[PDB]
CSV table of C-alpha atoms and ligand atoms in Angstrom, one decimal:
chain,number,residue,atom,x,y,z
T,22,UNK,CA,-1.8,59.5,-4.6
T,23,UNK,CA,1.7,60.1,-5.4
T,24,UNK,CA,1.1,63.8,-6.4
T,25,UNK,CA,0.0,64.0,-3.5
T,26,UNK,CA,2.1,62.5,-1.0
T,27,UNK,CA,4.7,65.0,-3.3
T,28,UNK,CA,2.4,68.1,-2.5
T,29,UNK,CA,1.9,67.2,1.2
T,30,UNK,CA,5.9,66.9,1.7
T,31,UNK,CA,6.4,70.3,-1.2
T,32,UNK,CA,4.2,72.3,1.3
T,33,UNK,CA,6.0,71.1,4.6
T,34,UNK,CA,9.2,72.1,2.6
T,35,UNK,CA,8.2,75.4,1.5
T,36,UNK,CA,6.9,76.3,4.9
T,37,UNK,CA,10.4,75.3,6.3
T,38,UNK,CA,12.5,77.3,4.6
T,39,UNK,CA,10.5,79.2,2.0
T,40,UNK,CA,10.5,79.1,-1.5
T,41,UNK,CA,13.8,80.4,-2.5
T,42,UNK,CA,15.5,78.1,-0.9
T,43,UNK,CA,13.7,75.4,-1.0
T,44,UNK,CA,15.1,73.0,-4.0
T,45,UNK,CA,13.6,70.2,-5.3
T,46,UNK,CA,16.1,68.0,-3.4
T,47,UNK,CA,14.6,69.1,0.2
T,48,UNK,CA,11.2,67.7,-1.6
T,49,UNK,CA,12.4,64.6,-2.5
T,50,UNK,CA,14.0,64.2,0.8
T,51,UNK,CA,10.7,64.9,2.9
T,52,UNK,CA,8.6,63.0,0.4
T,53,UNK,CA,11.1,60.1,-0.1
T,54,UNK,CA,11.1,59.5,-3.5
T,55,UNK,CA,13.7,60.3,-6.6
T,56,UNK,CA,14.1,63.6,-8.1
T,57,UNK,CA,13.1,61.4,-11.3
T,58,UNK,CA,9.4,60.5,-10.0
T,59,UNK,CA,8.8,64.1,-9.1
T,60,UNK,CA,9.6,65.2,-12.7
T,61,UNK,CA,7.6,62.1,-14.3
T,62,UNK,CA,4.4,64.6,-12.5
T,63,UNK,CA,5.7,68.4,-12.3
T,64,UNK,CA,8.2,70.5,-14.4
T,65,UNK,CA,9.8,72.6,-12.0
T,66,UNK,CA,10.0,74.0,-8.3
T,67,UNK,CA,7.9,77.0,-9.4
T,68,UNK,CA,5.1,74.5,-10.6
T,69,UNK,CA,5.0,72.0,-7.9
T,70,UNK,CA,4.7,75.2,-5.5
T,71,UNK,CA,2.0,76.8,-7.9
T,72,UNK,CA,0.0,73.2,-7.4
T,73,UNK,CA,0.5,73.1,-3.3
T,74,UNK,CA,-1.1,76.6,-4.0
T,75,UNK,CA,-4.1,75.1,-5.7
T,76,UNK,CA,-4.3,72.1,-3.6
T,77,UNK,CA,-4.6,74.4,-0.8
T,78,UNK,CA,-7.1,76.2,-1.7
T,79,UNK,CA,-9.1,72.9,-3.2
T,80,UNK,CA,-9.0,71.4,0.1
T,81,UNK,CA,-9.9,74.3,2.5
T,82,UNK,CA,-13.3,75.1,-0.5
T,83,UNK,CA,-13.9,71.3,0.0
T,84,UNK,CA,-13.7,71.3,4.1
T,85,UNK,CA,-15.5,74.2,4.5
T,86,UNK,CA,-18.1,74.5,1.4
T,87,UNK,CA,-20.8,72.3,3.0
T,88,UNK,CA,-20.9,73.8,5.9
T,89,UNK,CA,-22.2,77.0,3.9
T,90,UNK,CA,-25.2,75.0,3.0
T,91,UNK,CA,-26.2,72.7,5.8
T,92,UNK,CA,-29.2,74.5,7.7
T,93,UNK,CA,-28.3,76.7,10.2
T,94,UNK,CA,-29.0,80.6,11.0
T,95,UNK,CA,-25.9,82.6,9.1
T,96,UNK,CA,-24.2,82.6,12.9
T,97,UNK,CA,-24.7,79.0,12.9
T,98,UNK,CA,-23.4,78.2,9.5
T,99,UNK,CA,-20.2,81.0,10.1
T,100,UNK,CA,-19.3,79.4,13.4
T,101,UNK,CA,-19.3,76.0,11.5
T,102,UNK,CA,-16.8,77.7,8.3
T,103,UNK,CA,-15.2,79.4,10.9
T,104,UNK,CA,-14.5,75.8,12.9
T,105,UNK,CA,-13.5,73.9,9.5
T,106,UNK,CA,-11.6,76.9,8.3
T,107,UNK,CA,-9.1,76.2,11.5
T,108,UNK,CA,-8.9,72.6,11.5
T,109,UNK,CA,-7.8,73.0,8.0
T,110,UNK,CA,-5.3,75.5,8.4
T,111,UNK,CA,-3.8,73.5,11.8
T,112,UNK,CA,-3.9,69.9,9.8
T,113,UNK,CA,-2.7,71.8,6.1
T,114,UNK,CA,-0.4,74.4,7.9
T,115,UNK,CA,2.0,74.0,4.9
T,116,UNK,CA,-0.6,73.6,2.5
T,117,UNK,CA,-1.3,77.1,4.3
T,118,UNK,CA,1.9,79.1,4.5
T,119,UNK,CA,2.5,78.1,0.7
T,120,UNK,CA,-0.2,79.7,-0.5
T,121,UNK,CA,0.7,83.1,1.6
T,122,UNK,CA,3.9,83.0,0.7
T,123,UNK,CA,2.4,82.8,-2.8
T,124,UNK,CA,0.5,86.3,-2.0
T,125,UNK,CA,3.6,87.7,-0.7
T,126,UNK,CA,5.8,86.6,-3.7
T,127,UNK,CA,2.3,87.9,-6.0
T,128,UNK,CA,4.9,90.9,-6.9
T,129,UNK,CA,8.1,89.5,-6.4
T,130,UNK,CA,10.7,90.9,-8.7
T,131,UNK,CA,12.9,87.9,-8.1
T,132,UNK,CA,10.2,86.0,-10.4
T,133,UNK,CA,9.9,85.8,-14.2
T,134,UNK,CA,6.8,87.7,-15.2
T,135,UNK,CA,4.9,84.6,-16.2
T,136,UNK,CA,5.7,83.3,-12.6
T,137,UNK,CA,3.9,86.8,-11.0
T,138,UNK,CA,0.9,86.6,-13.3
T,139,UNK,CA,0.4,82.7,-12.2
T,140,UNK,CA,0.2,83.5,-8.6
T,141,UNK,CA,-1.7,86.8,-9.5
T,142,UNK,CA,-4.3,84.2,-11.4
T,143,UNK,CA,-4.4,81.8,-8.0
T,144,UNK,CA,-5.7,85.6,-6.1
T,145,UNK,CA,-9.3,84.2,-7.8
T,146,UNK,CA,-9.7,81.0,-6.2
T,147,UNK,CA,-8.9,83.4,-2.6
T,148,UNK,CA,-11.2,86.2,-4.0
T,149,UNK,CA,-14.3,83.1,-4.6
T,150,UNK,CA,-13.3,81.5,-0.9
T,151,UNK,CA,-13.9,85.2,0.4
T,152,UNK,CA,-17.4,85.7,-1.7
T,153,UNK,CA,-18.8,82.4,0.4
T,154,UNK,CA,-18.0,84.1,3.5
T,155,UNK,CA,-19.1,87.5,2.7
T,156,UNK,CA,-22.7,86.0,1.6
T,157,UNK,CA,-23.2,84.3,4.9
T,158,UNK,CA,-22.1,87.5,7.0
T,159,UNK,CA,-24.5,89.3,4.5
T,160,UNK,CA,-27.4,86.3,5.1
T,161,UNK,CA,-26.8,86.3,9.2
T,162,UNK,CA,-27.3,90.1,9.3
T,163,UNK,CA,-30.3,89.7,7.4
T,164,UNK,CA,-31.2,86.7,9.7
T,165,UNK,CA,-30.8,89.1,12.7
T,166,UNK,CA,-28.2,86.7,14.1
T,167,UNK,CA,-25.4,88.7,13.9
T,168,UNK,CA,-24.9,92.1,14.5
T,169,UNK,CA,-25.0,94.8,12.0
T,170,UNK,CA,-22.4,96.0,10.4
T,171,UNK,CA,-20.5,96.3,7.1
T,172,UNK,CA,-20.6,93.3,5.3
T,173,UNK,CA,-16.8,93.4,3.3
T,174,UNK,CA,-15.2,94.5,6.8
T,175,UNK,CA,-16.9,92.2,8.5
T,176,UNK,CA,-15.7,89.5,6.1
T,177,UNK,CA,-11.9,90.7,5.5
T,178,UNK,CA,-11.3,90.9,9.4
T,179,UNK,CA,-13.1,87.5,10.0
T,180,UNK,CA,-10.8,86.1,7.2
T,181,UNK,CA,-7.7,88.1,8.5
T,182,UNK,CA,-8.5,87.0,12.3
T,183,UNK,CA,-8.8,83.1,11.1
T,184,UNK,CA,-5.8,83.2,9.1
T,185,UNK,CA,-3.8,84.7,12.2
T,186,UNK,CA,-3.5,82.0,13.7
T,187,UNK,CA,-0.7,81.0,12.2
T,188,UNK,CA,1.3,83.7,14.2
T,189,UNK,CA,1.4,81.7,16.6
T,190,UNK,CA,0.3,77.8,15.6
T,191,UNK,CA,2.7,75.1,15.3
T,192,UNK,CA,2.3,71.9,14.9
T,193,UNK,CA,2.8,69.2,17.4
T,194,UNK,CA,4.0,66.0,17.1
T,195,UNK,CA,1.4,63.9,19.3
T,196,UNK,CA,-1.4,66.7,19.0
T,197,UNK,CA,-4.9,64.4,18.5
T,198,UNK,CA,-7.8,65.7,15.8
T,199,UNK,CA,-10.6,66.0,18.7
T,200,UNK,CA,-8.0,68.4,20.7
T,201,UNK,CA,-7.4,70.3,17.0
T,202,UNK,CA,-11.0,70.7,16.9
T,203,UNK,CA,-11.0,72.3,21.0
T,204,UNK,CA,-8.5,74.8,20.4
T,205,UNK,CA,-10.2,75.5,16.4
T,206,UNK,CA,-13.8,76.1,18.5
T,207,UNK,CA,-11.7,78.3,21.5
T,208,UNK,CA,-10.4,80.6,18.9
T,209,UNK,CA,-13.8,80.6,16.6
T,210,UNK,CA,-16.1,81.4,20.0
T,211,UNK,CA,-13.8,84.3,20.7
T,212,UNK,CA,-14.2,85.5,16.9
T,213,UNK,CA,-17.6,85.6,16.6
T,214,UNK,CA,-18.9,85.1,20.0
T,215,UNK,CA,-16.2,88.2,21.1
T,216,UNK,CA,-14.7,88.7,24.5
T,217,UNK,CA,-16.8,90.6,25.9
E,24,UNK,CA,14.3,115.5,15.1
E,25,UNK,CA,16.3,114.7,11.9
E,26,UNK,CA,16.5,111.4,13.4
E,27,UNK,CA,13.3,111.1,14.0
E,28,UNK,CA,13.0,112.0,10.0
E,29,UNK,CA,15.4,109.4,8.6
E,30,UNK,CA,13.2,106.7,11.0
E,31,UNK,CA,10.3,108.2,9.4
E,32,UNK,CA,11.2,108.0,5.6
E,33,UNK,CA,13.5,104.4,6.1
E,34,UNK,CA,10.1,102.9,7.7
E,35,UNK,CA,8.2,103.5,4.4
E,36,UNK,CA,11.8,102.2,2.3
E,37,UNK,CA,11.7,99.1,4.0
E,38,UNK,CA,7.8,98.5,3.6
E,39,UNK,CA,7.9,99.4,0.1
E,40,UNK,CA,10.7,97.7,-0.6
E,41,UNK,CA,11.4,95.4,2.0
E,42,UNK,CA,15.1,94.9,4.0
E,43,UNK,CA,16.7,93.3,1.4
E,44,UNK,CA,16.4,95.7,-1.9
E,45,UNK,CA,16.0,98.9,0.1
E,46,UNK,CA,19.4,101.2,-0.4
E,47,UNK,CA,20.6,103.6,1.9
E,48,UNK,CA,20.5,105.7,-1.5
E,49,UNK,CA,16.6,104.8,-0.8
E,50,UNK,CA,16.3,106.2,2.2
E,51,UNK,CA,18.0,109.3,1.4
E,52,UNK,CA,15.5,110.3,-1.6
E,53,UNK,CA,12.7,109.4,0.9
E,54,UNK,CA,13.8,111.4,3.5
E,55,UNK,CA,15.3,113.9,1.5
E,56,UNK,CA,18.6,114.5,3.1
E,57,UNK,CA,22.0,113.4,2.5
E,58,UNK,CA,24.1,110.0,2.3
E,59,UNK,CA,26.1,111.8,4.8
E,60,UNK,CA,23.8,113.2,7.4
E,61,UNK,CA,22.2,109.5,7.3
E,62,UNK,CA,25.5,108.6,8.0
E,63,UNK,CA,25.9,110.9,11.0
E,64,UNK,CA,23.0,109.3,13.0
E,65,UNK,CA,23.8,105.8,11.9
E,66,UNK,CA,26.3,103.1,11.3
E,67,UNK,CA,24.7,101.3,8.5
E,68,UNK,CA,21.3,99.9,7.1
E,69,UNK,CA,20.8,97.3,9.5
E,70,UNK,CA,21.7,99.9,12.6
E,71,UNK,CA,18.8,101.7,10.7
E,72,UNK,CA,16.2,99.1,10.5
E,73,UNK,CA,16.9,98.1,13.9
E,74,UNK,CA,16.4,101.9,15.1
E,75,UNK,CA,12.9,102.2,13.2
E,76,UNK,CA,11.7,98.9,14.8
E,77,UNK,CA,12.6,99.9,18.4
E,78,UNK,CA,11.2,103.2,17.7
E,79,UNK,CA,8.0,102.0,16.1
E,80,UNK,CA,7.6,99.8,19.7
E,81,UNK,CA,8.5,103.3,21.4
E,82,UNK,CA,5.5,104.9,20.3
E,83,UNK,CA,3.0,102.2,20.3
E,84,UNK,CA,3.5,101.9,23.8
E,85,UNK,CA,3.4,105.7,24.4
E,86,UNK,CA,0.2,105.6,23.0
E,87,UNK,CA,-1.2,102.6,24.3
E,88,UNK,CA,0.2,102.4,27.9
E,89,UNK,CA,-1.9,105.4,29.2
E,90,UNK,CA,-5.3,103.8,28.1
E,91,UNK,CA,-3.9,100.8,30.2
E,92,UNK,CA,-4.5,102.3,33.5
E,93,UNK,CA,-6.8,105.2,33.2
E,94,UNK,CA,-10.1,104.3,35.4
E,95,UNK,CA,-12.5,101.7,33.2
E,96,UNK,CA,-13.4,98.1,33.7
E,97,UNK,CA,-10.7,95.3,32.1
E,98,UNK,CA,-13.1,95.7,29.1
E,99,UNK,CA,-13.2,99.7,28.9
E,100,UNK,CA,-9.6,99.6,29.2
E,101,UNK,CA,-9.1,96.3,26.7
E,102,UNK,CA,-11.2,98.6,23.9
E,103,UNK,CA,-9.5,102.1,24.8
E,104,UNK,CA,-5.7,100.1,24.2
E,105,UNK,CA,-7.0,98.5,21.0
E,106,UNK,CA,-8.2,101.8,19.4
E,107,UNK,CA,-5.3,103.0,20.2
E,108,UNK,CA,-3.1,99.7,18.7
E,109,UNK,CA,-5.2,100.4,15.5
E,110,UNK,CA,-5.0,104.1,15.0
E,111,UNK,CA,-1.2,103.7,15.8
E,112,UNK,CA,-0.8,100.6,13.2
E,113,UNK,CA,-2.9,102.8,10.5
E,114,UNK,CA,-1.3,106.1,10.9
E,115,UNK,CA,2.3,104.5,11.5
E,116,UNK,CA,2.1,101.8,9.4
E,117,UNK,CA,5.5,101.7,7.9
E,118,UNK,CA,6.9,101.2,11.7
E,119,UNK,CA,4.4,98.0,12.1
E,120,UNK,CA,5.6,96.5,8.8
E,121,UNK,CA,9.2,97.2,9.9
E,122,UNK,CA,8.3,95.7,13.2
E,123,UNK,CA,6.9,92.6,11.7
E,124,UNK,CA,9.9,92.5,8.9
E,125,UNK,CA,12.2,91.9,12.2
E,126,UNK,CA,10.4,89.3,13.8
E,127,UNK,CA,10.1,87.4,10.1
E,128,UNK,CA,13.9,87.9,9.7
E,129,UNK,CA,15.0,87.4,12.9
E,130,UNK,CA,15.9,83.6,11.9
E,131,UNK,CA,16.8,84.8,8.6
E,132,UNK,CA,19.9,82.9,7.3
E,133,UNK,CA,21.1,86.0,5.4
E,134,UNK,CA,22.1,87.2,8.1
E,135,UNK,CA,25.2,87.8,10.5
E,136,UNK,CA,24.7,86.2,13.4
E,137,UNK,CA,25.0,89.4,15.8
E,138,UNK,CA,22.5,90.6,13.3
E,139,UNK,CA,19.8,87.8,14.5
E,140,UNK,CA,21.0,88.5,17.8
E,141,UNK,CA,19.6,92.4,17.8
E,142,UNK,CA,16.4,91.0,16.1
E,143,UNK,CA,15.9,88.4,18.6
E,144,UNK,CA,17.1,91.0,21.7
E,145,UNK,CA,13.7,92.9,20.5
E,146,UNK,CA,11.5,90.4,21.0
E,147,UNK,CA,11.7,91.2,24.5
E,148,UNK,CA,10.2,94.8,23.4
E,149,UNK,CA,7.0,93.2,21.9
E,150,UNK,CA,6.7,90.2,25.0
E,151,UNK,CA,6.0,93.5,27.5
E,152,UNK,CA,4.3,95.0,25.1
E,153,UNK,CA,2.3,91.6,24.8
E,154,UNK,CA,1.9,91.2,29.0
E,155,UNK,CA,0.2,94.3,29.5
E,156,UNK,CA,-2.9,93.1,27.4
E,157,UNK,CA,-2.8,89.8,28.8
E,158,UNK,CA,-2.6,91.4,32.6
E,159,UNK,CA,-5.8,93.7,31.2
E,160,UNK,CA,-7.5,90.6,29.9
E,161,UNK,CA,-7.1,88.9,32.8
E,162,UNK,CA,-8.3,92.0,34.9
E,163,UNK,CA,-11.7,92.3,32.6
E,164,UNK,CA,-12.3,88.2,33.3
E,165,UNK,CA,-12.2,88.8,37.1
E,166,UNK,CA,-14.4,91.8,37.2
E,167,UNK,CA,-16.9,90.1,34.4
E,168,UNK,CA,-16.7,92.5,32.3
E,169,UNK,CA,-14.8,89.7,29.9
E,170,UNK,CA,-15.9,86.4,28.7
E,171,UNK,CA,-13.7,83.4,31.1
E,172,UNK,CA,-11.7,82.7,28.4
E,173,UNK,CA,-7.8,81.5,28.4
E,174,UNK,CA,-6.2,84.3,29.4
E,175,UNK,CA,-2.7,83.8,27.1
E,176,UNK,CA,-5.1,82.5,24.2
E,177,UNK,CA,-7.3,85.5,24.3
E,178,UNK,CA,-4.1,87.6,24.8
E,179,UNK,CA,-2.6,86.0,21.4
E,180,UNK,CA,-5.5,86.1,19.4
E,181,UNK,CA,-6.7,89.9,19.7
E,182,UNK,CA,-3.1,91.1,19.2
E,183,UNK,CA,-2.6,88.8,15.8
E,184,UNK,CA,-6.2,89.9,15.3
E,185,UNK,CA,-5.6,93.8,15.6
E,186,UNK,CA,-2.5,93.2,13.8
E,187,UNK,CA,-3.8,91.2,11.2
E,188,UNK,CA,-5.2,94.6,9.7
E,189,UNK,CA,-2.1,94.9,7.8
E,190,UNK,CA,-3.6,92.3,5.6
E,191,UNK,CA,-6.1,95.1,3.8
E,192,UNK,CA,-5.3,98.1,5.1
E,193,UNK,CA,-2.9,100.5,3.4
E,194,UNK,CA,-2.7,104.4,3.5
E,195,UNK,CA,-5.0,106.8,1.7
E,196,UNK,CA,-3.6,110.1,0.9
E,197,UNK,CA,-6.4,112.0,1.7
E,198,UNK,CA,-7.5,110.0,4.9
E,199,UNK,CA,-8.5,112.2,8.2
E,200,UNK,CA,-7.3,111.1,11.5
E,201,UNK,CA,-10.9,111.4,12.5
E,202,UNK,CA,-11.9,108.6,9.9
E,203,UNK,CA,-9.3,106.4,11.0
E,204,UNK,CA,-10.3,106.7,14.3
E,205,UNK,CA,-13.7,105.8,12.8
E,206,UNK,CA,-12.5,102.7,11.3
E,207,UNK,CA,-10.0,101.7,14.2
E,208,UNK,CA,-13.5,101.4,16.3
E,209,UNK,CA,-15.2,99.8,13.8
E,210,UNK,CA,-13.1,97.2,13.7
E,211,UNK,CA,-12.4,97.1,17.9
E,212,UNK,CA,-16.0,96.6,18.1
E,213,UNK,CA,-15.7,93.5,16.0
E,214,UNK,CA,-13.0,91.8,17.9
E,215,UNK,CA,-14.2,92.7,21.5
E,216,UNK,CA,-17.8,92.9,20.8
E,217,UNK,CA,-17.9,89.6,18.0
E,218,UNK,CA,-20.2,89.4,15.2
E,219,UNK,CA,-23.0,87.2,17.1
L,16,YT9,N1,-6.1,79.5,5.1
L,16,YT9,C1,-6.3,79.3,3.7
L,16,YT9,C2,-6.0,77.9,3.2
L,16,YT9,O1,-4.7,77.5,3.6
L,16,YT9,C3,-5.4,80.2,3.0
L,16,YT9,O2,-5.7,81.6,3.2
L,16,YT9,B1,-7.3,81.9,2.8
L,16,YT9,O3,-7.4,83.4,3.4
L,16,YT9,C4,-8.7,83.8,2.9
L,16,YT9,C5,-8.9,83.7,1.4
L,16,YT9,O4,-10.1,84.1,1.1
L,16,YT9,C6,-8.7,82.2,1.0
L,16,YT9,O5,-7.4,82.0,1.2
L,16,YT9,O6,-8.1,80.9,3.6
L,16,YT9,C7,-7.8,79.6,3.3
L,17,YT9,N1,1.7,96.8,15.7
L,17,YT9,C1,2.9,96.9,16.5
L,17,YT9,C2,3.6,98.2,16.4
L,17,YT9,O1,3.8,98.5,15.0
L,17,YT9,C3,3.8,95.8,16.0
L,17,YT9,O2,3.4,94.5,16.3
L,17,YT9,B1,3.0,94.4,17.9
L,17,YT9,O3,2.3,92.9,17.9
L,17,YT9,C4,2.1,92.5,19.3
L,17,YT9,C5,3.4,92.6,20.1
L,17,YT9,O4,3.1,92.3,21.4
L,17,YT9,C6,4.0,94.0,20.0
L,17,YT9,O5,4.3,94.2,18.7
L,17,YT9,O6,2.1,95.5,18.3
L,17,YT9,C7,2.6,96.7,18.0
């Protein structure tokens, strides 16, 4: 797990001071290990922060995909994505601003071209993550356990609501996993539940 | 209203291009005046982006502040502002990103430091802005017409969430004001009214 003690200290990094300035040295400095293990495993900056990209997303599909298929109503299995999604992006908040950063930088001039058409290629695993949501907002209309309306809105402001959290979530040094959980399930029963 | 103008055209500079790369010499071709009338009304690039943000809070709260205390329940009110945050974000959009540009730079080490300063004074714009939902929110839980929810959490979430349209939407050249207006409540009825 040495990759990945490198990718959880890249991400924490990156979300510090963003990837220009980031260097390979503020890595090796939050990981605590030599600039020569990191290059043993990756070849530059741009590629460790094109794998905390893909870790990212591998972690969230991982969290969240079974919840998608345990039985449930689709309001029941959305609430229980919706929940997952959270705790992953509170737990994996660098994981998290690394890979928007990544969509912000998708276009970024300041890039070689091969650099753009990388993160352009990551946009797939976000466009599959968004597919799994969309079916279950498609399956809970049909279910009659959420209200109708247009599937893909439904789905990009769902998606666009959980991921704003992160205006205003930062993370706390003696914060427990149950309490994580609390404040995930506060903001998901406002989502789907709505306030009024 | 030439200065209104220039505010007009340097919003859509700065979203297209962001703070960094956009050019006086930018703002003049989008505006369509001169280096020297831009120069008339302001001191420099930065004196503009700071003009467009305060300006882009000006009329947010123009439009928004009547719906605030026109007769409703806390819930007629809380959907009457957040039309009106929407169509606002949709049909100025280039002020919202400029507004969000700001806040994102106000820590920015590019910077002067007088330069965070100004940044940092307007956060004092958006906090106001930011009360006056959370005073309506709390209004609508005390005459039921709101879920009891956490007041400040509630607060938080709907404005990240009616901002967090800036994720998808962009302008259509051919868009009515009566379609947005159609959209704005689509989505409204999502955030305030849920998916369940
Ligand atoms: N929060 C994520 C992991 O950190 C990153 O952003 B997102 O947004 C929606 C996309 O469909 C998948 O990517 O959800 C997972
Ligand atoms: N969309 C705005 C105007 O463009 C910019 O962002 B905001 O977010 C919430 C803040 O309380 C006020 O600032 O709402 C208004």
């Amino acid at each position: 797990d040495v990759k990945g003690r490198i990718l959880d200290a890249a991400a924490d990094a990156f979300m510090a001071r963003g990837f220009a300035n980031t260097t390979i040295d503020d890595i090796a400095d939050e990981v605590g290990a030599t600039k020569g293990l990191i290059y043993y495993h990756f070849r530059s900056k741009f590629d460790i922060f094109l794998a905390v990209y893909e870790d990212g997303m591998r972690r969230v599909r991982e969290r969240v995909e079974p919840h998608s298929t345990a039985p449930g109503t689709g309001h029941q299995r959305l609430e229980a994505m919706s929940i997952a999604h959270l705790e992953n992006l509170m737990t994996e908040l660098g994981y998290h601003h690394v890979v928007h950063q990544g969509v912000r930088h998708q276009d970024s001039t300041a890039l070689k071209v091969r650099q753009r058409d990388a993160l352009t290629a990551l946009n797939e695993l976000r466009r599959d993550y968004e597919r799994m949501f969309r079916r279950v907002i498609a399956e809970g209309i049909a279910d009659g356990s959420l209200r109708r309306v247009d599937e893909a809105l439904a789905t990009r402001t769902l998606l666009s609501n959980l991921n704003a959290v992160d205006v205003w979530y930062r993370k706390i040094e003696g914060q427990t996993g149950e309490e994580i959980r609390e404040l995930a399930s506060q903001v998901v029963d406002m989502l789907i539940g709505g306030l009024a």
